[PDB]
Amino acid sequence: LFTIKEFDGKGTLDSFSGDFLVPSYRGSTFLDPKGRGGATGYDNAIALPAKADADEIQRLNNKSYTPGKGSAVFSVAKVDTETGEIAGVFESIQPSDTEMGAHPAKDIKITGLWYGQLT
Amino acid sequence: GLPWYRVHTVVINDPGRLISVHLMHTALVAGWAGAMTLFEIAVFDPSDPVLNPMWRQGMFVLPFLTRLGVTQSWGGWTISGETSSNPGIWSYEGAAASHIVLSGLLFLASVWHWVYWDLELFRDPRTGKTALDLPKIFGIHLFLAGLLCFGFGAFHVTGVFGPGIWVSDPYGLTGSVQPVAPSWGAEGFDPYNPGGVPAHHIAAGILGVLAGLFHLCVRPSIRLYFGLSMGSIESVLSSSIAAVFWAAFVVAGTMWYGSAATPIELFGPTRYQWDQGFFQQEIQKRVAQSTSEGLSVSEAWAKIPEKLAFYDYIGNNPAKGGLFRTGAMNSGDGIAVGWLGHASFKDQEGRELFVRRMPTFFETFPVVLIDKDGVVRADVPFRKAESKYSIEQVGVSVTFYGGELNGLTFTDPSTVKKYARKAQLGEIFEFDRSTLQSDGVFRSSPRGWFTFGHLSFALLFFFGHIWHGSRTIFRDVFAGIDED
Amino acid sequence: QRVRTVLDMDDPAKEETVKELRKDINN
Amino acid sequence: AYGEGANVFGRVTNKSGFVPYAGDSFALLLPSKWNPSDEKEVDSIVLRYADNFDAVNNVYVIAQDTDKSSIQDYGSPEEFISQFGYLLGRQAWAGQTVSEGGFDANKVSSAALLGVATEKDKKGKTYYKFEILSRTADGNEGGRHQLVKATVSNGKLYLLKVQAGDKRWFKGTDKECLGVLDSFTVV
């Protein structure tokens, strides 16, 4: 989930850095291919009436939707002061989807441009 | 030349080589019986007749050996869990070896009859043509079959000279091979009465002997001879195939519904014992008794036998398997190694709740806890939002009586949910799955596999009977119509 | 001993039990 | 074999869409197509009916027991409905989720109180009448509308709750749900 929400960036005009919330990729009502989820679901593998046990607690007995954090550094260039608009470049690093807690997250580095209007 | 599906027709008018191919077939079938016995002995584990009986291990011909009296092995173990110090010749391996030797002897006889096919015995003394007096041969065979049926019923199964047959209690706890007295009243036609088997075999053997004597004596009429084509061996084949699939339907129904000749200690429980609450009713009646007598709940559940508790478990249902779920039930859900005890569920208010048991149709079933009066009081919801009956909301605890968890009470919902999900399947057991790498999916019982194979064979043999009756009646137009 | 209690106790676990299916015209 | 003639050309039967039900110390109109159900999600329920289509559209009458002389003693309609949130259904989810969308924090259920009103009756009875829209993170049937009509009579708190799907609500179950709601007379 490429996100920037709740970003609190402190710094200078040249560069200001900060953190933003990274919500869970899937909601708690999301259902896996076997109909196991968070807010919904079977809570276990029911196609296997004698296999859904404690050795696959990561997959079925628990579903995790803990939010994460991401870092972002923004740089300002190409400012129009008569129209109150600013351009610049941004540099973000954020975790990937963890399925629903079933795999460790990878880190994605997103470079890009950004634009804004002031007041 | 011949189509590949007509090759075996070369022995229609060759009685000696018909005898030869019959002898080869008999050799193959006896050799299969011996080899299958040796396979099942090699893979059979006899160390726990209670929680790992033969029908949990995929044993198919081992129950048929045990049914008629062969109960001991040369490996020093008895099928009833006792010690065999003198198994004698007729052990499981002894019957296997006897069938292998019989197969070899029948192979040699088949070779001899293939080579020496041109016996003057098969020549009609009047015209010199090859012929079989099929009514006379049927009379001889019916006389012999009646003699054998009468002897089997009057000496083997009665225990007069043989060992008897397997007889058990109604709940499959104290079964053994016993002599059986015949039942000559209407109760002799009770399917579950063991006494019906000797009475049937004695009476039917006497009738077979009398009818065989009749068919030895009395020649058929010309009208019925031409109507049934008693000069053609294919007519006999069609009628024999008809009788054989009739018998296959009978044995498939008998195995599926249960009878005195299909004990649950040998073949497993039936699906109707789960459907109609047979073992559940017996267990609850045995718990209700000795509660009125004045015992607590921790005992009088320890008094319940683990064999009965294992019988009350849907994983032993023959109608919970699959067409391609292969092998033993142990390979399906593990080897059962212990009864955990009865699970009693209660809510915060203190009323007793019961898990709705899974019906036979349902591969999956929702977990529902119902009170005494039929009101749903708790469940494991699919929608854990705006729910009103979850285990967390209702406050359900579980207490175990009689097993390895006797006296223990669990209140955490994460464990109450799993124990309710296990109680959905009946009595709760612990299973060793690492030994056979069980996949956690239910298999089928030997009685289920027997019923499936024999019903399929019965339909295919109905088609074969149709085809051969057609061939007999319409022989003169088999290659085509007369064109005039 | 209490057939009514054992009936009403087998019933919620299994409604197809023969004790429930037998002599229930009286009920 | 008891001879009773069929109804051929016999005009009409009752097609009003409602049937009168007189319970113990209350009377209300039920939808004509709804079947009675033995389910009691609240242990003090004396009546339940559910739609033949879906069991989301249901209705029940709580009798219970109360100590206040009148429902006016519950302060206000808002203070009266703030004490019956268990009628909504407890959220059984325990993991933190800020990724459900417009659902605050760790919440997968919400209740928007669309309106509160006081309705006084011919016999002197005063009723509290409540439109509540409950919505979930999956949002089954676009949310469920709850209709509450409650009053205190004798020494008990009579309450009527009517639950309908929003999809059913704009399909046209709103008419029958409001007909059930406006027919609740306790006295």
Ligand code: CLA
């Ligand atoms: C194992 C039993 C057995 C068998 C296999 C036979 C076979 C024979 N008997 Mg028989 N017989 C026997 C015992 C037996 N018998 C006994 C116990 C008696 C009394 C002592 C006799 C006395 C007897 C007499 C008096 C005669 C025969 C004769 C015959 C021959 C011709 C039969 C015939 O026309 O069928 C009839 C033709 C059929 C096609 C029968 C088919 C069966 C029906 C149609 C199946 C329909 C099933 C259907 C789905 C309905 C099912 C419903 C369910 C409720 C049943 C044949 C060799 C005759 C002969 O020539 O012998 C010298 C003769 O006249 N038998």
Ligand code: CLA
């Ligand atoms: C009436 C026949 C009959 C019956 C009812 C049984 C029943 C049983 N046998 Mg058995 N057996 C039989 C004859 C029979 N057998 C014969 C003739 C042999 C010699 C080949 C064997 C050899 C044998 C072995 C060696 C073993 C069994 C085992 C089993 C048990 C496990 C379930 C099962 O059958 O596997 C599952 C059955 C099936 C999946 C049936 C297949 C369905 C059909 C045939 C498929 C249709 C044909 C299709 C076109 C084939 C194409 C496939 C191709 C692409 C590969 C079961 C109690 C096992 C066991 O538990 O041992 C203790 C085991 O390992 N048996």
Ligand code: CLA
């Ligand atoms: C057709 C019905 C029938 C069937 C299937 C059975 C089945 C059984 N009987 Mg039997 N029984 C019957 C009728 C039947 N019986 C009758 C009519 C009688 C009264 C006489 C009895 C009385 C009875 C007794 C007295 C006992 C049994 C026992 C047995 C069991 C093992 C013996 C056996 O059959 O091994 C299978 C046998 C074979 C496959 C035959 C093998 C043929 C050999 C290998 C060929 C010959 C070998 C030889 C070397 C040939 C060359 C000769 C040369 C050296 C001169 C078996 C379950 C025994 C038991 O209690 O078991 C525990 C036992 O002691 N039966």
Ligand code: CLA
């Ligand atoms: C003293 C008298 C005596 C005693 C006490 C018995 C006792 C017994 N006999 Mg009997 N019998 C006797 C003498 C006796 N017989 C004599 C003198 C004869 C003549 C030789 C027979 C011939 C005989 C037959 C031919 C049958 C028995 C059977 C039985 C059993 C009946 C209970 C049972 O399991 O049926 C269960 C069996 C049935 C109810 C048979 C139903 C068959 C239906 C009608 C047709 C099924 C096939 C049909 C084509 C359906 C196709 C599939 C469908 C879906 C389309 C029992 C062991 C039956 C048996 O061995 O059962 C295992 C059996 O089939 N007996």
Ligand code: CLA
């Ligand atoms: C001395 C010979 C002999 C003996 C006594 C045994 C003994 C045994 N064999 Mg057998 N068998 C033998 C020869 C023998 N066999 C031969 C010749 C073959 C090749 C065909 C085999 C092939 C064979 C197999 C395939 C199997 C055995 C098995 C068995 C065991 C149990 C038998 C059983 O369940 O009966 C059950 C038998 C029946 C129910 C047959 C009933 C007869 C029908 C109903 C007759 C119907 C038609 C009839 C003409 C009607 C009569 C009319 C009436 C009026 C008279 C037992 C150890 C079983 C086992 O567990 O092996 C490990 C098994 O699977 N045997």
Ligand code: CLA
């Ligand atoms: C015991 C019963 C029996 C016996 C004695 C026969 C005998 C005969 N049948 Mg058959 N038939 C029967 C049952 C029987 N049938 C059944 C059950 C079916 C329906 C499925 C039919 C349908 C039928 C047809 C449609 C035809 C015959 C024909 C024939 C003739 C030549 C067969 C041949 O060369 O095959 C040769 C077969 C092969 C070379 C290979 C077959 C391999 C099969 C498909 C799989 C392997 C089978 C396996 C090894 C055995 C285990 C199964 C067993 C337990 C049954 C011969 C007279 C023919 C005929 O009338 O000729 C004029 C003919 O066209 N049969």
Ligand code: CLA
């Ligand atoms: C679709 C079914 C059907 C068909 C069309 C055939 C076709 C054939 N059969 Mg038959 N047969 C069948 C099934 C069938 N059969 C079954 C299920 C049995 C019992 C095992 C047999 C037994 C049988 C024998 C043993 C023989 C044949 C033969 C023949 C041939 C001559 C015609 C004949 O005698 O008819 C048979 C007549 C019928 C099938 C009609 C039966 C009508 C019954 C009496 C109705 C009874 C109803 C009664 C109220 C019971 C109700 C029970 C209920 C309560 C459950 C022909 C190729 C004969 C032949 O010459 O072959 C070359 C022969 O020898 N048949």
Ligand SMILES: CCCCCCCCCCCCCCCC(=O)OC[C@H](COP(=O)(O)OC[C@@H](O)CO)OC(=O)CCCCCCCCCCCCCCC
């Ligand atoms: C113990 C182990 C035993 C091993 C088993 C040995 C037997 C194995 C082979 C037996 C069967 C051989 C069949 C030969 C087939 C064959 O011989 O050719 C066709 C065959 C030829 O009939 P004729 O009488 O004209 O043949 C004359 C001779 O040349 C044939 O002997 O006709 C048949 O009746 C056979 C079956 C109908 C043919 C149709 C069946 C095939 C259709 C398949 C459809 C697939 C497409 C699916 C798409 C959805």
Ligand SMILES: CC1=C(/C=C/C(C)=C/C=C/C(C)=C/C=C/C=C(C)/C=C/C=C(C)/C=C/C2=C(C)CCCC2(C)C)C(C)(C)CCC1
């Ligand atoms: C020579 C001789 C000998 C030896 C013998 C022997 C060694 C024998 C054997 C044998 C054997 C060892 C046999 C076996 C067999 C087997 C069989 C015969 C089988 C089979 C099969 C089938 C037929 C099947 C089919 C199938 C399948 C494949 C799967 C599923 C389906 C079905 C079932 C169809 C002696 C010395 C004694 C004497 C002298 C002479």
Ligand SMILES: CC1=C(/C=C/C(C)=C/C=C/C(C)=C/C=C/C=C(C)/C=C/C=C(C)/C=C/C2=C(C)CCCC2(C)C)C(C)(C)CCC1
């Ligand atoms: C020589 C001779 C002859 C010929 C004969 C014949 C032709 C025979 C045959 C035979 C046969 C025809 C046989 C067969 C067989 C079979 C077998 C022996 C089998 C088997 C199998 C198995 C062992 C299996 C395995 C398995 C399983 C377990 C399951 C499934 C899959 C598998 C494969 C894995 C005549 C008579 C002319 C003359 C006299 C002499």
